[PDB]
Short mmCIF file of C-alpha atoms and ligand atoms in Angstrom, two decimals:
data_model
loop_
_atom_site.label_atom_id
_atom_site.label_comp_id
_atom_site.label_asym_id
_atom_site.label_seq_id
_atom_site.Cartn_x
_atom_site.Cartn_y
_atom_site.Cartn_z
CA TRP A 1 0.00 0.00 0.00
CA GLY A 2 0.95 3.64 -0.13
CA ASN A 3 1.29 5.57 3.04
CA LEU A 4 -2.44 6.06 3.53
CA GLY A 5 -3.15 2.33 3.37
CA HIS A 6 -0.37 1.43 5.80
CA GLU A 7 -1.43 4.01 8.32
CA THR A 8 -5.05 2.88 8.01
CA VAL A 9 -4.04 -0.74 8.65
CA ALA A 10 -2.10 0.49 11.67
CA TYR A 11 -4.95 2.54 13.17
CA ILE A 12 -7.30 -0.43 12.75
CA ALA A 13 -4.89 -2.57 14.65
CA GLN A 14 -4.68 0.13 17.37
CA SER A 15 -8.46 -0.17 17.73
CA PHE A 16 -8.31 -3.93 18.50
CA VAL A 17 -5.15 -4.67 20.46
CA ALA A 18 -5.39 -5.35 24.24
CA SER A 19 -4.29 -2.40 26.44
CA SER A 20 -1.34 -4.58 27.57
CA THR A 21 -0.37 -4.98 23.90
CA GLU A 22 -0.59 -1.23 23.43
CA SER A 23 1.86 -0.76 26.29
CA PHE A 24 4.17 -3.44 24.98
CA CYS A 25 4.26 -1.77 21.55
CA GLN A 26 4.63 1.79 22.74
CA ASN A 27 7.60 0.93 24.95
CA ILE A 28 9.35 -0.87 22.07
CA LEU A 29 8.77 2.01 19.71
CA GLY A 30 9.60 4.79 22.23
CA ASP A 31 6.32 6.31 21.09
CA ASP A 32 3.64 6.94 23.73
CA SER A 33 1.42 8.94 21.34
CA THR A 34 -2.06 8.11 20.21
CA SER A 35 -0.71 7.22 16.69
CA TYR A 36 2.12 4.82 17.96
CA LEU A 37 1.49 2.16 15.20
CA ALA A 38 0.49 4.51 12.40
CA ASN A 39 3.56 6.71 12.99
CA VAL A 40 5.95 3.82 12.18
CA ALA A 41 3.83 2.08 9.53
CA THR A 42 5.55 3.73 6.52
CA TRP A 43 9.22 3.60 7.75
CA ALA A 44 10.09 0.35 5.89
CA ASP A 45 9.22 1.98 2.53
CA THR A 46 11.78 4.73 2.84
CA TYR A 47 14.32 2.65 4.80
CA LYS A 48 14.64 0.20 1.89
CA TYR A 49 16.02 2.96 -0.32
CA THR A 50 18.86 3.88 2.05
CA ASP A 51 22.32 2.33 2.02
CA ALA A 52 21.74 0.53 5.31
CA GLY A 53 18.24 -0.68 4.40
CA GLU A 54 18.67 -1.91 0.82
CA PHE A 55 18.82 -5.57 2.06
CA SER A 56 15.14 -5.23 3.06
CA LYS A 57 13.60 -4.24 -0.30
CA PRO A 58 12.53 -7.82 -1.09
CA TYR A 59 10.71 -8.17 2.22
CA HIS A 60 7.71 -6.23 0.90
CA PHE A 61 6.23 -8.90 -1.34
CA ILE A 62 6.20 -12.52 -2.43
CA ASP A 63 6.40 -12.88 -6.19
CA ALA A 64 3.82 -15.63 -6.78
CA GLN A 65 4.71 -17.58 -9.96
CA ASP A 66 1.12 -18.35 -10.89
CA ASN A 67 -0.99 -17.74 -14.02
CA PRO A 68 -3.62 -15.04 -13.43
CA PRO A 69 -6.44 -14.42 -13.94
CA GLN A 70 -7.25 -18.05 -14.69
CA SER A 71 -4.97 -19.78 -12.12
CA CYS A 72 -3.70 -18.23 -8.83
CA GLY A 73 -1.60 -19.59 -6.01
CA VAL A 74 1.37 -18.81 -3.78
CA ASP A 75 3.99 -21.28 -2.61
CA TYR A 76 6.61 -20.25 0.00
CA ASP A 77 9.64 -22.17 -1.22
CA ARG A 78 8.84 -21.65 -4.90
CA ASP A 79 8.13 -17.95 -4.63
CA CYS A 80 10.05 -16.42 -1.73
CA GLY A 81 13.53 -16.44 -3.20
CA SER A 82 17.00 -16.59 -1.76
CA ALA A 83 17.10 -12.90 -0.65
CA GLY A 84 13.86 -13.17 1.43
CA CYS A 85 10.31 -12.05 1.03
CA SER A 86 7.33 -10.86 2.99
CA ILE A 87 6.75 -14.30 4.49
CA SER A 88 10.38 -14.83 5.56
CA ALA A 89 10.50 -11.31 7.05
CA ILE A 90 7.32 -12.03 9.06
CA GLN A 91 9.00 -15.12 10.48
CA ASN A 92 12.33 -13.32 11.20
CA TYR A 93 10.89 -10.21 12.83
CA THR A 94 8.16 -11.96 14.72
CA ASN A 95 10.73 -14.28 16.21
CA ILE A 96 12.97 -11.35 17.22
CA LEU A 97 9.99 -9.90 19.10
CA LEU A 98 9.13 -13.18 20.78
CA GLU A 99 12.74 -13.91 21.86
CA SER A 100 14.32 -10.45 22.37
CA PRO A 101 11.68 -7.74 22.75
CA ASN A 102 14.07 -5.74 24.98
CA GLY A 103 16.99 -6.01 22.53
CA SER A 104 18.23 -3.51 19.99
CA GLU A 105 16.57 -5.31 17.05
CA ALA A 106 13.03 -5.04 18.53
CA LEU A 107 12.30 -1.53 17.33
CA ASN A 108 12.90 -2.28 13.59
CA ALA A 109 11.28 -5.70 13.96
CA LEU A 110 8.01 -4.14 15.15
CA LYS A 111 8.13 -1.50 12.44
CA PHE A 112 8.63 -4.28 9.92
CA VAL A 113 5.73 -6.40 11.20
CA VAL A 114 3.34 -3.43 11.21
CA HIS A 115 4.26 -2.55 7.61
CA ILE A 116 4.59 -6.04 6.08
CA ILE A 117 1.34 -7.44 7.42
CA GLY A 118 -0.29 -4.58 5.56
CA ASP A 119 1.74 -5.24 2.31
CA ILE A 120 0.76 -8.94 2.36
CA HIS A 121 -2.89 -7.86 2.05
CA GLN A 122 -2.28 -5.85 -1.12
CA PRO A 123 -3.02 -8.58 -3.79
CA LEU A 124 -0.26 -7.41 -6.19
CA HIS A 125 2.33 -7.81 -3.40
CA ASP A 126 1.51 -11.57 -3.75
CA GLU A 127 2.06 -11.77 -7.54
CA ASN A 128 5.08 -12.04 -9.85
CA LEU A 129 3.52 -10.78 -13.14
CA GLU A 130 5.21 -7.63 -14.45
CA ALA A 131 6.99 -6.97 -11.13
CA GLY A 132 3.75 -7.14 -9.10
CA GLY A 133 1.94 -5.17 -11.78
CA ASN A 134 4.53 -2.31 -11.82
CA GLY A 135 5.14 -3.07 -15.50
CA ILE A 136 1.46 -2.81 -16.48
CA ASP A 137 0.85 0.75 -17.65
CA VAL A 138 -2.65 2.08 -17.20
CA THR A 139 -4.68 5.27 -17.32
CA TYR A 140 -6.32 6.46 -14.15
CA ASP A 141 -8.37 9.73 -14.16
CA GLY A 142 -6.61 10.68 -17.40
CA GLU A 143 -3.05 10.33 -16.07
CA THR A 144 -0.68 7.52 -17.00
CA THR A 145 0.36 5.33 -14.06
CA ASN A 146 0.71 1.62 -13.43
CA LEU A 147 -1.50 -1.13 -12.04
CA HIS A 148 0.56 -1.57 -8.87
CA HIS A 149 0.43 2.20 -8.12
CA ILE A 150 -3.35 2.41 -8.41
CA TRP A 151 -3.86 -0.52 -5.95
CA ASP A 152 -1.27 0.88 -3.57
CA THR A 153 -2.20 4.54 -3.81
CA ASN A 154 -4.66 5.99 -6.31
CA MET A 155 -7.71 3.90 -5.36
CA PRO A 156 -7.26 3.78 -1.58
CA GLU A 157 -6.67 7.60 -1.42
CA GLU A 158 -9.74 8.19 -3.59
CA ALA A 159 -11.84 6.06 -1.27
CA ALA A 160 -10.44 7.59 1.94
CA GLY A 161 -10.73 11.13 0.56
CA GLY A 162 -7.05 12.02 0.92
CA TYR A 163 -3.68 10.95 2.32
CA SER A 164 -2.92 12.58 5.70
CA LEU A 165 -2.64 10.80 9.06
CA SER A 166 -5.95 12.37 10.02
CA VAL A 167 -7.58 10.99 6.84
CA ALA A 168 -6.07 7.57 7.62
CA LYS A 169 -7.49 7.63 11.19
CA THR A 170 -11.00 8.51 9.95
CA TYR A 171 -10.82 5.73 7.34
CA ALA A 172 -9.63 3.26 9.90
CA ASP A 173 -12.49 4.36 12.18
CA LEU A 174 -14.97 3.67 9.30
CA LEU A 175 -13.56 0.16 8.66
CA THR A 176 -13.30 -0.57 12.38
CA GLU A 177 -17.09 -0.01 12.81
CA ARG A 178 -17.60 -2.34 9.78
CA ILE A 179 -15.73 -4.99 11.73
CA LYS A 180 -17.43 -4.45 15.09
CA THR A 181 -21.05 -3.96 14.05
CA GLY A 182 -21.24 -3.54 10.32
CA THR A 183 -20.85 -5.51 7.18
CA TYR A 184 -17.80 -7.52 8.24
CA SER A 185 -19.08 -8.36 11.69
CA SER A 186 -20.26 -11.85 10.78
CA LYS A 187 -17.05 -12.78 8.93
CA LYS A 188 -14.40 -11.32 11.11
CA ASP A 189 -14.23 -14.18 13.70
CA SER A 190 -13.08 -16.37 10.74
CA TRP A 191 -10.36 -13.84 9.76
CA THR A 192 -8.06 -15.14 12.52
CA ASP A 193 -8.61 -18.81 11.99
CA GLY A 194 -5.55 -20.85 11.76
CA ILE A 195 -3.44 -18.06 13.38
CA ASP A 196 -0.41 -19.74 15.03
CA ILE A 197 2.32 -17.68 16.77
CA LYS A 198 4.61 -20.74 16.70
CA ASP A 199 4.31 -20.98 12.91
CA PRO A 200 4.77 -17.54 11.30
CA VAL A 201 5.40 -19.02 7.88
CA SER A 202 2.14 -20.99 7.79
CA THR A 203 0.18 -18.10 9.30
CA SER A 204 1.43 -15.37 7.01
CA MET A 205 0.99 -17.78 4.01
CA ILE A 206 -2.70 -18.03 4.84
CA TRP A 207 -2.95 -14.28 4.57
CA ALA A 208 -0.82 -14.04 1.43
CA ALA A 209 -2.86 -16.82 -0.22
CA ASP A 210 -6.10 -14.97 0.73
CA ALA A 211 -4.94 -11.72 -0.84
CA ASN A 212 -3.53 -13.56 -3.86
CA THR A 213 -7.02 -15.01 -4.78
CA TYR A 214 -8.10 -11.46 -5.55
CA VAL A 215 -5.43 -11.25 -8.24
CA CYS A 216 -7.62 -13.61 -10.24
CA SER A 217 -11.08 -12.57 -9.02
CA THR A 218 -10.67 -8.81 -9.06
CA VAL A 219 -7.34 -7.32 -10.10
CA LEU A 220 -6.92 -9.04 -13.47
CA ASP A 221 -10.26 -10.75 -14.29
CA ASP A 222 -11.18 -8.09 -16.87
CA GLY A 223 -8.20 -9.27 -18.97
CA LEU A 224 -5.09 -7.33 -19.92
CA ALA A 225 -6.59 -5.80 -23.08
CA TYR A 226 -9.24 -4.08 -20.94
CA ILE A 227 -6.72 -2.98 -18.32
CA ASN A 228 -4.40 -1.57 -21.07
CA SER A 229 -7.12 0.54 -22.80
CA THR A 230 -9.73 1.68 -20.25
CA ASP A 231 -9.64 4.46 -17.69
CA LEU A 232 -9.65 2.50 -14.43
CA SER A 233 -11.16 5.29 -12.25
CA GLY A 234 -14.61 4.25 -13.45
CA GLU A 235 -16.21 0.84 -13.18
CA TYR A 236 -12.82 -0.76 -12.27
CA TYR A 237 -12.54 1.47 -9.22
CA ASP A 238 -16.18 0.73 -8.36
CA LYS A 239 -15.67 -3.04 -8.15
CA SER A 240 -12.15 -2.78 -6.64
CA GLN A 241 -13.21 -0.63 -3.74
CA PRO A 242 -15.08 -3.26 -1.63
CA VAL A 243 -12.23 -5.72 -2.21
CA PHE A 244 -9.40 -3.42 -1.11
CA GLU A 245 -11.51 -2.14 1.83
CA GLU A 246 -12.12 -5.65 3.08
CA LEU A 247 -8.41 -6.51 2.66
CA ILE A 248 -7.32 -3.32 4.56
CA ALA A 249 -9.80 -4.23 7.36
CA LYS A 250 -8.50 -7.81 7.44
CA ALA A 251 -4.86 -6.57 7.49
CA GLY A 252 -5.64 -4.37 10.53
CA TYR A 253 -7.63 -7.05 12.37
CA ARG A 254 -5.02 -9.72 11.72
CA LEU A 255 -2.14 -7.37 12.65
CA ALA A 256 -3.91 -6.69 15.99
CA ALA A 257 -4.33 -10.37 16.68
CA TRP A 258 -0.69 -11.06 15.80
CA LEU A 259 0.53 -8.22 18.02
CA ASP A 260 -1.59 -9.53 20.94
CA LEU A 261 0.06 -12.95 20.49
CA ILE A 262 3.55 -11.44 20.41
CA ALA A 263 2.88 -9.30 23.49
CA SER A 264 1.57 -12.35 25.37
CA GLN A 265 5.23 -13.63 25.21
CA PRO A 266 4.27 -17.31 25.22
CA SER A 267 6.59 -20.01 26.62
N1 DCZ B 1 7.88 -7.68 -7.70
C1 DCZ B 1 7.55 -6.61 -7.03
C2 DCZ B 1 8.35 -5.44 -7.12
C3 DCZ B 1 7.98 -4.39 -6.40
N2 DCZ B 1 6.88 -4.42 -5.59
C4 DCZ B 1 6.48 -3.24 -4.85
C5 DCZ B 1 7.60 -2.73 -3.95
C6 DCZ B 1 8.05 -1.42 -4.58
O1 DCZ B 1 8.17 -0.46 -3.53
C7 DCZ B 1 6.86 -1.00 -5.43
C8 DCZ B 1 7.21 -0.20 -6.68
O2 DCZ B 1 8.40 -0.71 -7.32
O3 DCZ B 1 6.20 -2.21 -5.81
C9 DCZ B 1 6.10 -5.57 -5.50
O4 DCZ B 1 5.10 -5.56 -4.76
N3 DCZ B 1 6.46 -6.66 -6.23
C1 NAG B 2 16.60 -10.83 10.32
O1 NAG B 2 16.55 -9.47 10.72
C2 NAG B 2 17.85 -8.87 10.81
C3 NAG B 2 17.72 -7.41 11.28
O2 NAG B 2 17.18 -6.57 10.24
C4 NAG B 2 18.53 -8.88 9.44
O3 NAG B 2 19.84 -8.31 9.61
C5 NAG B 2 18.58 -10.25 8.77
O4 NAG B 2 18.80 -9.96 7.35
C6 NAG B 2 17.29 -11.03 8.96
N1 NAG B 2 17.40 -12.48 8.87
C7 NAG B 2 16.74 -13.24 7.96
C8 NAG B 2 16.99 -14.70 8.13
O5 NAG B 2 16.01 -12.82 7.06
ZN1 ZN B 3 2.71 -0.92 0.89
ZN1 ZN B 4 3.27 -1.72 -3.31
ZN1 ZN B 5 6.22 -1.88 1.58
#
């Protein structure tokens, strides 16, 4: 996601974590503010472009070698690669937090988890084709961009009505009520099924596989001819919106559950 989506995921998670989990996270981050998760949710995206952080660029995605839109699927060992991936980073950083939450690696680990659980829920971060859709040029509201950029940025910002932290908090609040009492309320108990703190690979693969299905069902089902030649701010936006909103909600709800597990510090 772009910044807006990450911060939204973060604020959603803030709305669900146990108070003890809040305290655990704040102390790790050295951030006692009311935006403790959202404040750090974008760091990994600028860090990866620094000298020191370059190693972490591949941790943002898993390049699924499938065949969309007619066949989708992700496979850890096939797709991750020898320099790491979103799944491997979830395992690494979760384990740092479980083993050494008071160590010097905890701060970046938590920032990584917050960010990467959001990226896993962006369907094109679970897809190899054209560099996760970066190589698919499209028109959006009369401006040339690419398919990855519109899923990360153009469509979520359009839906949220902007890009600031305040806009992210309001959007998170809207999706949070959808979870608690609204249209996701019946489905959200199933959103944390199979969650296992002792198996980060399996757990984060569930989530990556969930997002990846939408590559076939939603992202690319119109066919590449259509995507190449149609302004995607119209009917494409209209059908995409409920899909990326549910995935942002799920990322926030699942991040919260994962953080509660981490903070529980199980033997
Ligand atoms: N195979 C790729 C390559 C990149 N990206 C993401 C991470 C980059 O920050 C962004 C734009 O290059 O797209 C992705 O999801 N999958
Ligand atoms: C685990 O995290 C540390 C700290 O960023 C990093 O140096 C290392 O590359 C990671 N290990 C694995 C196995 O990905
Ligand atoms: Zn992102
Ligand atoms: Zn992206
Ligand atoms: Zn990222």
